[PDB]
Symmetry: D2
Subunit: 457 residues, 4 copies
């Protein structure tokens, strides 16, 4: 099985027996990917165990994979481990169950439904401020991922189930506890590496009701939901929206529980981690932070409360957000299984091959980005934003399987940043890691957690 790329005249690094090239993940996906791109060119291959994975960096080729032949050929992502009933979550589901599921949950994420969610996310914007000011009034360096974790959790709890907790001060609410265990997967920790070497063991685990989702969190929420379900039934949030949907092919109950869980998992560490990357960049580029605080005050004078419309109004805000995702695209890669022997843009792809787009590397490619490591929001000026290829810059992926939660993720984050910058300024501490070193692990996240000083305006 290790001769496939050698036969198709595709270049790449040499796979050791059983391991493939996984030993080369010792500097993380990102670094490996950047190195590979440099050595091998526009396309290359490698092996995750016996799994062949082919990399591609041609925007046209990418578009065909992610848009054109999405339905016919490149419809699903790669399996990664045992999942139990979470087999039915949309980000995991495959082919027709997916298309079906994608349909039942899309109206939930309209610009319409989203404009309705704005006042709630706004209320926890406030709760954030109060908590921050408590630390700002006690001149003690702040850990963002905490305060932001607390926030991002606060907004999920309230927008998916309408449970309204100040998780930062109520860390020990059972509803807060279980949900905090739903953290992004380290695909380079002991366990998943083994799965990569012995995927033949995945079935043995499924048959043991072992799941990568801790059996206790899921069981907590399954019943939590079936309570909420039958407390609102009968007597505005994602659950409501999903309960309304199965009031017609219609969403099953366990299906409904599954999605709910994934929304938490999806929004939680991601909204948290991204907000952290942005405060780091703002504090190490004080000019940008000033330019922002002034735009914010112009649209929203007297520290006016942001709205759905005043948010899309702000352009330097969108630029700062976008540039950050360029430097830190927390998905790192996009991936699709090739379900048929196909030929796309002149290249034969055999079946079962996993096709991969190395986002991190591309967002940091000198051939598309002047001074790529530098933090320069002006790349996204309405003057230069046009020059940017949508299939090189893909922080939310692209095509029928792009991030369903993108509009929501972007607003969530911006509503926070405004209210925060309306009130404080963020200054580097001595214990602040400048320049931020990235984790050599399997998540896009800082080597050392970001600590900053905060001051009241």
């Amino acid at each position: 099985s290790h001769g496939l790329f050698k036969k198709l005249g595709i270049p790449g690094p040499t796979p050791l027996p059983f391991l493939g090239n996984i030993l080369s993940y010792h500097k993380g996906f990102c670094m490996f990917d950047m190195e590979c791109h440099k050595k091998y060119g526009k396309v290359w291959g490698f092996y995750d165990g016996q799994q062949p994975v082919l990399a591609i960096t041609d925007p046209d080729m990418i578009k065909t994979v992610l848009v054109k032949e999405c339905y016919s050929v490149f419809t699903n992502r790669r399996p990664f481990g045992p999942v139990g009933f979470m087999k039915s979550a949309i980000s995991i589901a495959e082919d027709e169950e997916w298309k079906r599921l994608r349909s039942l949950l899309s109206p939930t994420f309209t610009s319409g439904k989203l404009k309705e969610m704005v006042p709630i996310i706004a209320q926890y914007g406030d709760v954030l401020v109060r908590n921050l000011r408590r630390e700002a009034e006690t001149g003690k360096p702040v850990t963002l991922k905490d305060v932001f974790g607390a926030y991002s959790m606060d907004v999920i709890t309230s927008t998916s189930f309408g449970v309204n907790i100040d998780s930062l001060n109520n860390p020990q609410d059972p509803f807060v506890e279980n949900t905090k265990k739903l953290l992004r997967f380290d695909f380079l920790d002991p366990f998943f590496l083994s799965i990569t070497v012995f995927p033949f063991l995945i079935p043995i685990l499924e048959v043991l009701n072992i799941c990568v989702f801790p059996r206790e969190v899921t069981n907590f929420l399954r019943k939590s939901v079936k309570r909420m379900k039958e407390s609102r039934l009968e007597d505005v949030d994602f659950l409501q929206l999903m309960i309304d949907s199965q009031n017609s092919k219609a969403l099953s109950d366990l299906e409904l529980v599954a999605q709910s869980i994934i929304f938490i998992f999806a929004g939680y560490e991601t909204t948290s981690s991204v907000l952290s990357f942005i405060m780091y960049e703002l504090a190490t580029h004080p000019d940008v932070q000033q330019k922002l605080q002034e735009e914010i005050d112009a649209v929203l004078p007297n520290k006016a409360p942001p709205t759905y419309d005043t948010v899309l109004q702000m352009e330097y805000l969108d630029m700062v957000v976008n540039e950050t995702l360029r430097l830190f695209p927390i998905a790192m890669r996009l991936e699709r299984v090739c379900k048929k022997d196909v030929e796309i843009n002149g290249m034969f792809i055999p079946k079962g091959v996993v096709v991969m787009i190395p986002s991190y590397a591309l967002h940091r490619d000198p051939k598309y980005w002047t001074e790529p490591e530098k933090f320069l929001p002006e790349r996204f000026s309405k003057k230069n934003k046009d020059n940017i290829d949508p299939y090189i810059y893909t922080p939310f992926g692209s095509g029928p399987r792009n991030c369903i939660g993108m509009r929501f993720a972007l607003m969530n984050m911006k509503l926070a940043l405004i209210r925060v910058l309306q009130n404080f300024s963020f200054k580097p501490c001595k214990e602040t890691q400048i320049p931020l070193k990235l984790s050599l692990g399997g998540l896009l996240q800082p080597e050392k957690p970001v600590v900053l000083k905060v001051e009241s305006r």
Copy 2:
């Protein structure tokens, strides 16, 4: 997983934990199936481990499965174990590789190509006679499966590769040895039962290059073929026909080796075992045997050599053959995986369910057959043959995945039977098992091997 049939209001026997109903295979597939049909009605379910298997006996419903929605829904059979490169044999291949493969091998089985193969199969008809007469001249009771095994092997060797061995007298020819190990699979022996309980182990075995096809036989033939291939290339048989085919999507070389192997496996014990069932029936119904010997002598007077055309000429011959397959349909069941949630003839079939047609039981069903256990060829008289439902009587299955080798199997067998009955008469011995008890195992085959007395006409 064991609640599926209970939910769909389908009846059946209660599955024990992990085993399902496999413990009920202690009297073999056939008996279990007959019992089930009687208890539970027109449709029922059971579990091979965790695998749900639904039985169906409505001819309409059957037709939809085997013909109508063959391509869309019910395209493949159930996996059964580790297969290695034999993954590419047609009877094993799935979906598009299958349709493709089915296409490249069909012209090989035309009435045209078959009429060309007749003189070769005829030559080993002769070799059979000589061997039989040696035993007939030495009044020693004969074991058919041997003499017939020897024959059926002789015809394969010669029709697939043109190697011409008298295997009965050359039992120790390397080409004869390897090929005799390709015997039908006992799906109720220790090994396959475990596979049924731990299908999650199948992948562990594949990854150990362990295959249910002994790694030595296959390796013998792979190279045997790549010799023949390059001895004829360059300087009438199935190999020729397949080599000509890849002289164009065209048949690969290892693909070609795979099919060759399956043709042997397919034709060998089957042509042998069926010919045995027929001699048993003939000898325990001496009237039928006389009626046959007289028809044979009328079409072919002076013991004239049968031809392609004189063979299709013989009608009592076809009746005797057909009735035998009714009583002994060596496939026992037909099976299809349900690849989508579907509804056929008013019944909801969830995905992944294996759908099954219990041939043996149906061929022995009193509601379609008067005195079913009795051996009465007149059921297939051109007068009554019309009254027989093609979707109740299915010894070669039906629809796009029916037995590719049916015409060939039927002629093979008839060419033998004529030449044999032209010369001898077969009389029961005292050591003959009357009435023939069927094996309680996982193959349709006699409990005790068939021994008969043979006399020269």
Copy 3:
């Protein structure tokens, strides 16, 4: 493998393929064991999967197993699953690592060291009272396992590491949280039953650093200990005692962490569950409760604080405790692997066979106990205590591998019961389950949790 007992002329129930007799655990170990004893006699066998397990109820035979040939033949218990570094905990360790470990931890459990621990366990006796009175003053039915759980945890935290938490009011102390997850193992839950059917999977799990001890609790305590270790080093409890021991074959650090963990696991739900069984019995036998409260007040007048010496002073106290363990011997069984072909008291035991003593059943055997189901403490009167066979009554097992923590467990429990009965009386509620039904699961524990009314004296 399933023919072993059939060959040795030992009776028992018939094992199904792969499962053995595990299907007969549907009414729990206890019931199965009681039934078996009745049907089959003094000795019998059955199969946990392919594992042969032989039961024995002859006190002599038992003594040989648990005492005489302990070292030579019956030294270890049966493996049960993947354990990681907890392979080194004493209750799990085998043979020479065990004997060694047993030696390094025994001085920790002297009558000497124990008399020193009495004032600390006394302080949380007090904390218990206050908490109870809060519920007693608010006439709301009380759940014992909670209040007692809280207590039993309080005493462990303080006696193993000197951390002093009121866990009932501090439920959300990180030290309290992790440790509450160390609960007795349900050997009849989905997971362990599978392990019993596929013990061949245990090694696959070990090789995945999966452990039946949640990898987070253990990792919390490993470092927690290595802090305490290096905070006391340098600047009375089990840790001290173990740190002093490795200040010499001497206790390693990870070895030390392992034992610490097992002491928690051991003492926690056990001290809790037993105290619960006793309050149930006391409240459904009000006479006994009065007789006790009067003995307590005689030794300790003016609600005097109990001491080590006033505790061993109390005889009706010991009787009540003992009788409870008769009815509820929370270990249920004792077990030893037979490491050699041996013959003990006239019976040939082949190697690898697990030998078992069915405590629950024996403690409830009419041939040794008049009215066994009845609760009658007088069985243990210094007059009748003599008539009781130590190898029929074994709540703490017996011999070199008996419960290392017995003296400590007994004092712990009695110190609680005195202080509690000194202050309140416990009366059945309407929601109280009379008579207590036992869990049909794999732990000795009540079907419904015990709720009682509590009143201030």
Copy 4:
């Protein structure tokens, strides 16, 4: 687990994750071992998967392992795969079953019993001659392993069961066929390498009655023996000797079948392969061959038939044999599992570590052997034989677990060589591989099979 040798300050090559150093077996055990010895010194370690294996080359240390603490510590060899009932063969059995089994089979291999076997092995010496002369009279280059295979098989068949076949001319005798499949194990073929990486899969295989001994050969012999057993019972060979032994702790029947099988496996390819190595050396050192033919003719004039006593009479014969085993010690390594934490000759060996003696390398060590690659029988002259350390030269191992079949193996081989050299001379062909390259695989055997010219004296 990969840090063990690093901790004990033992040197060696760096293990990759999961594989250990197995990738370094690409030039075979022998080469790896020679390289290691050179780099790392007198002792070193490496990992076969996760299995630590420590090498040792100090003769004293070796003696302690193989003799002194054999019983107490280093009693068994390493498991290698699934074995089924062959678990009971002596070379596989462990600890007390071994000691027992070793005792019941030792009297079978006395100098006494051996002197009785000499005339039978002599008769097939003759059959060899006739076959050789047929090739010698038809000047066609000869393949030794064949003719010798044929011989070595002939002598086993006759000495273990008294079945008397000329296997070279009867290649197709069922008794000859099955037994020829019992060939030495390639511990570097796909299968065993996987076992080395996933030893956790060995139990899954055992539970599938899969055995590294083909289930058909063993089943053939099991019944073959139980026939012979009951044909001689009732109405001189190893079977007789074992049947007599169980006529007394006494040999069971399946136990008996197991040993019989191992004797075949043991003697077959080994006697064959060694005889081949010797003819190669003789023909590439024509001087030695002449010196031998003259000694042979002196003890046995007029081509007199060798006897037990005339065989031990011949000293250049013993020298030639011995030197060959120096250059080609077909066991390659000796191995013992360390069953306890021990310290031997100043070195701490933790438990479970496999201890290894690299025979091949040591026999070719310049520090003990002048011109080691050269073939010089005079090393074993009764003058220099004294200077040779028995714990450096170990072709049959040493100590309580040395080759049980050594006396027999040596006589077998010498009886052949005499009768052969009495009649022919062996001259290199052009197609002869000079100098013989060794297989880079996992058996000591020539890269290309040895072909020589043979001439009649």
